Amino acid sequence: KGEWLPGLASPDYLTGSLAGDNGFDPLGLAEDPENLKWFVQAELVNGRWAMLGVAGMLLPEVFTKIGIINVPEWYDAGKEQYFASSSTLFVIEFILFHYVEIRRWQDIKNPGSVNQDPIFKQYSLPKGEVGYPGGIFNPLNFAPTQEAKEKELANGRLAMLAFLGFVVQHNVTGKGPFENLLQHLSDPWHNTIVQTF
Amino acid sequence: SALFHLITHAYSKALLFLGSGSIIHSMEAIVGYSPDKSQNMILMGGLTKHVPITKTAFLIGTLSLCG
Amino acid sequence: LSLWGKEEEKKLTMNNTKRASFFCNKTYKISNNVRNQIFITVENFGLNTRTFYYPHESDNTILFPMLILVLFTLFIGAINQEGIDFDEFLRNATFSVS
Amino acid sequence: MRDLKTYLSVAPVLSTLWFGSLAGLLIEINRLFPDALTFPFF
Amino acid sequence: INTEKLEDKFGRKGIKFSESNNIPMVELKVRNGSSLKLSLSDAHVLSYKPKVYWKDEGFEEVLYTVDGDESRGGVGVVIVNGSSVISGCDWSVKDTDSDAIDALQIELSCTAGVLDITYIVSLYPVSMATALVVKNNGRKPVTLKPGIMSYLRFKKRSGAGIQGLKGCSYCPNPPLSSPFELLSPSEAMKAEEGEKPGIWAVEDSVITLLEKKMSRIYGAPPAERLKAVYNTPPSKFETIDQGRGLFFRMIRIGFEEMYVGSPGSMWDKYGKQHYFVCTGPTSMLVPVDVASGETWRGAMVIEHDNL
Amino acid sequence: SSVCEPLPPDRPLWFPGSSPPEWLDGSLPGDFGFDPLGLGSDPDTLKWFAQAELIHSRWAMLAVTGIIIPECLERLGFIENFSWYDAGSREYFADSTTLFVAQMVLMGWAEGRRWADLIKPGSVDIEPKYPHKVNPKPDVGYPGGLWFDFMMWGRGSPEPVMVLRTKEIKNGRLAMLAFLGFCFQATYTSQDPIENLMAHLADPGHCNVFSA
Ligand code: CLA
Ligand code: CLA
Ligand SMILES: CC(/C=C/C=C(C)/C=C/[C@@]12O[C@]1(C)C[C@@H](O)CC2(C)C)=C\C=C\C=C(C)\C=C\C=C(C)\C=C\[C@@]12O[C@]1(C)C[C@@H](O)CC2(C)C
After folding, report:
1. Which of A33, B40, B42, F164 registers the highest number of CB atoms within 10 A of its CB?
2. Do C56 and F133 touch (CB under 8 A)?
3. Distance, CA D42 to ligand 1 centroid (Å)?
4. Which positions are annotated as binding chlorophyll a 4 (chain F)?
5. Hey, what domains does chain E have and what are their CATH numbers?
């Protein structure tokens, strides 16, 4: 499905069946098919978590600057005092993430294994493809068409690099992302990476 | 405003004439060589299906005159 | 080739005055049906200069001024302006567009 | 040039080219970042 | 594989004989990539995709059929007297060698006793050609009514018009009983604004809306009895789509009157997409009676002028 | 009409009376048999070296133009303080390092498309398709195209294609050497090329490289 470098050919292991299959495997990582179907899931989950992360560390900032709601800037957001401790959050984020991630693990190991509740055994999940559970993960029931999966993976690949840009625009700049965007739009030819270094 | 209208017409209808002559040189293969045949706007008919970039250029020109 | 293949003719040229359409239609009170007029509508043939090449695109030396003039008429069409240093807003505009 | 690229592909010529490039890299790094004993960039 | 026998006997360069799910079938492919799905041993066409756009995907489906039901969908020719004459599925090819790559022709042949119905489906680069020819052998003048009912799917339901049956009188007349129908003649004239008998009205519009149930036969075959000028209705019209910018044209040869059938709002009870129209010429309001031995020629051509 | 016919074996050589090598038959433009060392032995690599020569020469031609024409304008009184070997040190916006990375981005796109042409000819095709119109398949380095052959001079309109490509290559080899002269005699004289020309034309005898 398309090609990322027209001078290069899509490898034989990327047949275009998968969503987002522009043939980008220059370093031959998904050459074994097991690695391919594992890295599909790793891409989907890193991209979905990156979308949530970017949306949770940028949208706070574009609302802080305009003054709609004041909220911290994602790096001074840890040191704030919350209704629990700094580690209690880690305890909960371990207890009820181990359960959901090991069930996703059992799904990406064998697909039809884990779809019904432990407690309410009637409320099963439909037999969707791996990495796309559906059911209560689809309450509005927007269809998982291949174009939608491609849109998912594209926004996710974009949000991953956006998070990387955030980490490196706080590691060697010191300021937030949206402040860096306003600094770029102030004078684009004088507020870039090749002025900081 | 007179000079600005001069500029935009002189860059618009010039494009329109070059699109018309591209229409004409496309029609020369159909009708042979005759101005009552290869310049007759009646039997031109439709050329969107055949010459697309001429269509886009002529359309941007005629919208440049249609305002 | 025709619609019947090997029927109705070995092909027909010199199609005659088929006013009756070979239906043996008889005439009521009228002026004339047949006369001394024997005129065959001899049509032209097939399978000769058959191609009739559809109008393809001209070469690069025709499109290239048209592309540059497209870039002009898109660029000039939006010209804090240079109206004074070089040398009713919605209603009049929507009236002209209307 | 045919059969010169095969000679330059040979293990000693290729090793001296690789280690000359690598040694120049290390040498210019030590010019840029001399006297290094820690990695403080994290 | 009887189609393999037809392939190594009569198969040619643009002729591909196909046999899947024990159905004989042929696909005609002229040089410009025009597809024609003719179901063999049935005299029934399923699909037709001639090059409309100038892409590689210039081919566009014209005839309406659903994916599974080959007996319910597409143009099928029908002969009655007043019962169905050609319902026997004994159709076999007669000759195929017509032209190399530019124009093709599959002519079928059957026999209904006194009637030797051989039947031509041709593929030209701009036109489907559907040609019926019967031939009497017994000592009986048959009073037959031919019929070629086509089902042209439209992409948008609002875009339906025929563009050119103005001036000639029409009569709402229920169609022929085909084995390859989409709507029966009982529901084709039910819940309209034309009345059920052959009432007469003069069409005073250059294009007709096919939004309602109102289905009719164009022409005046009661005028044909006078054999004056009798206002012979035109043998051509521009059926349109308007969902996307293409059109088609139907040309009759040998027939006299031309039927259209508008499904109206009753297309929902069989199909769900691509509203169609039941259009074709018949010799119905005045039948044809050939001879005790002669032959009759009647042809129909659906053509496109986009290419 | 458009075939790229080569030069004959009895063509003019760089060194008359010498034997041209067997890997320089004449398929390339400007083939005069120049190979004292024989760097173009492997033809799969001689193709890359022909593309190298072509692009090198085109850049050198644009460069010698951008050096001598603007110096003529400076002598005419249009541009101030012009000196090409100090025109990178002088002031602009964007610090000359933001300019460099923007240049690397844009030229990376352009030269990457050209690279994809070189590795596999039909990958990055341009001059968009037209109905019943067969855009001719071009050669590497001479894409033709609506963008690079808008006057349609590449298929052989004014002159044959081989002599025009030879014109490109010879004019451009001359420009490559002109730019080497620029890079050398602007540092061993610390002066202007056109100034050096007028200085040698003043007294050709004693105003040569041996004075300095
Ligand atoms: C095995 C034992 C040993 C160890 C542990 C060390 C360790 C060290 N020596 Mg000693 N040394 C040794 C043996 C050893 N040496 C011997 C045998 C000799 C005699 C030949 C010397 C003679 C010697 C001298 C004379 C000097 C050192 C110096 C150093 C320091 C190196 C600083 C430097 O340039 O690195 C910097 C780092 C690099 C060069 C590595 C760069 C690698 C490249 C750029 C790739 C990395 C990026 C990569 C892409 C990944 C990025 C992640 C992601 C984005 C992809 C370091 C403490 C120097 C010093 O500072 O003194 C303390 C110094 O002056 N050593
Ligand atoms: C970018 C430089 C470059 C490159 C790659 C080529 C490549 C080519 N030339 Mg062209 N040529 C060039 C510059 C170049 N030329 C210039 C500047 C001149 C005029 C002086 C010529 C004159 C010329 C003639 C007359 C002919 C060729 C021919 C050829 C082909 C065979 C030779 C070969 O493979 O050499 C590969 C060359 C290189 C890889 C570059 C050499 C790099 C090394 C390191 C030496 C550089 C130092 C140099 C000697 C410094 C100059 C010192 C100064 C005092 C003069 C090949 C297509 C023959 C042909 O068939 O034409 C198509 C032919 O007959 N060339
Ligand atoms: C999951 C993820 C980010 C998740 C972020 C989250 C939850 C953020 C949360 C927070 O911000 C909030 C909301 C609020 C703050 O108060 C708290 C924190 C906690 C800070 C990023 C993944 C980020 C992943 C990244 C950047 C991965 C990049 C990978 C690349 C470029 C891969 C390239 C290749 O692998 C391919 C594709 C194919 C190979 O063949 C070739 C190569 C070239 C090797």
Report:
1. F164
2. yes
3. 17
4. 171
5. 2-303 (2.70.98.10)
